[PDB]
Design a protein around this ligand. Sequence first.
Ligand code: A1AN5
Length: 166
Amino acid sequence: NSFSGYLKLTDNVYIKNADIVEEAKKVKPTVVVNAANVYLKHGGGVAGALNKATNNAMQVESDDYIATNGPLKVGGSCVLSGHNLAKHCLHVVGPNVNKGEDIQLLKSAYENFNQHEVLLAPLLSAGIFGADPIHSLRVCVDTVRTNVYLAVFDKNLYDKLVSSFL
Ligand SMILES: CC(C)[C@H](Nc1ncnc2c1OCCO2)c1ccc2c(c1)S(=O)(=O)CCC2
């Protein structure tokens, strides 16, 4: 967990303008959070990038999880191997508001982070999921009590988040 260049926002929330895959390789954290869907199909965005860095080992393992346990619920999670990126990968399903899923579930999604002392994570539901990224950061700051290091790849978004937070 050798996080470097983070800006401390609150006692337990840190933020950096960085690619989460590159951070995972440099830091080798205990837990890396994946912005997953309920079937753990990592076809793009953060999920696709993390899977591509494991050379599809995350996807094989995810398919085996789904075969045995069935899909996750929106707001839920599961802990799987982190392969070469981390000791564990916490797959968390935020609501896809662009498809009508309730924004209240974003609090339930962030609540999963509380079972891990330290995590490297993306902003949940801020992708193709269509949630307002600044609102997602507010839910994170209000819900997460353990230590979370957020990697936000876009410098324009990072600057807006830091300006909003101050
Ligand atoms: C907002 C965006 C800049 C950010 N992208 C990344 N943030 C950090 N690391 C990355 C990023 O994408 C390339 C790999 O590394 C982001 C954050 C959350 C979500 C997505 C994207 S999504 O994949 O569109 C859907 C799931 C939720």
